[PDB]
Amino acid sequence: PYTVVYFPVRGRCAALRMLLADQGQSWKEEVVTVETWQEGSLKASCLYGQLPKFQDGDLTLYQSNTILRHLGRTLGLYGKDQQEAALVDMVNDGVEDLRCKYISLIYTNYEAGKDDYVKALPGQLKPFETLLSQNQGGKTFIVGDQISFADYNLLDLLLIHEVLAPGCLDAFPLLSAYVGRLSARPKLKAFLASPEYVNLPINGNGKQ
């Protein structure tokens, strides 16, 4: 079945976890402690020397977005056709771009870079609001009328940014309602309120 190997943080595993939970899938969490990691053996066995590591039967995967696309492909959360599949990728690549900046700020220069980052945030979120405005008035999902892996990834992106910059979605009504709507999905809402998610820090350095 499914196994996710990661440090005890939400980080790059939050979106895929939301996906599995919302889709009613079962998986095992293999928690790797900083000590175990510093031992070196696991890290040396990882393709790119990093986590998360994911297992689907004997298929071993690395790279958070590969896991998301794999689950999206296998579970039918990758658009209804090739055109939608491309739009889903366009959304996810954009989500990834901002996540990288978020990650850089959090771990590289939180104190000195936060003000500049928050000032530039609106412009960074505008694209997703626009995407929403062009798809059924933003009443359904980011692409098409069915959920996709990019939805879970974008939702996480938005959630963590509201912790970083409380109220950042006030400027974006479609994104605001989208967060509330997706968060209300029964299995997702239950997962998001579970200690399995809540008692885990967003990042690994105590910043958010």
Give residue 136's identity as a one-letter amino acid code.
Answer: Q
Q: Which residues, numbered 14-43, are part of the site for ligand 0HH (CB under 6 A)?
A: 34, 43
Say if residue 8 is preceded by a cis peptide, omega within 30 of 0: no
Q: Which stretch binds ligand 0HH (CB under 6 A): 47-55, 121-129, 140-148, 177-185?
A: 47-55
Q: Are 10 and 200 in contact (CB under 8 A)?
A: yes
DSSP codes, 160-205: HHHHHSTTGGGG-HHHHHHHHHHHTSHHHHHHHHSHHHHTS-SSSS
Q: Which stretch binds its own copies (CB under 8 A): 29-37, 46-54, 156-164, 188-196?
A: 46-54
Q: Are 16 and 64 in contact (CB under 8 A)?
A: yes
Q: What are phi and psi of 55, to 5 degrees?
A: -125, 130
Is 12 a binding residue for ligand 0HH by CB under 6 A? The answer is yes
Q: How far is CA 136 from the centre of its chain?
A: 23
Q: What are phi and psi of 8, to 5 degrees?
A: -75, 70
> Least CB distance from residue 44 to ligand 0HH, whole Å?
10
Rounded to whole angstroms, how far apart are CA atoms 27 and 169? 32
Q: Considering only residues 1, 59, 166, 195, which one is a binding residue for its own copies as defined by CB under 8 A?
A: 59
Is 65 a binding residue for its own copies by CB under 8 A? The answer is yes
Q: Considering only residues 97, 116, 145, 196, which one is a binding residue for its own copies as defined by CB under 8 A?
A: 97
Is 63 a binding residue for ligand 0HH by CB under 6 A? The answer is yes
Q: Which stretch binds ligand 0HH (CB under 6 A): 45-53, 84-92, 133-141, 181-189?
A: 45-53
Binding site as annotated, residues? 6, 12, 37, 43, 50-51, 63-64
Residues lying near ligand 0HH in the complex (CB under 6 A) are found at 7-9, 11-12, 34, 43, 49-52, 63-65, 93, 97, 204
Annotated binding residues for glutathione, written as ranges, equal 6, 12, 37, 43, 50-51, 63-64
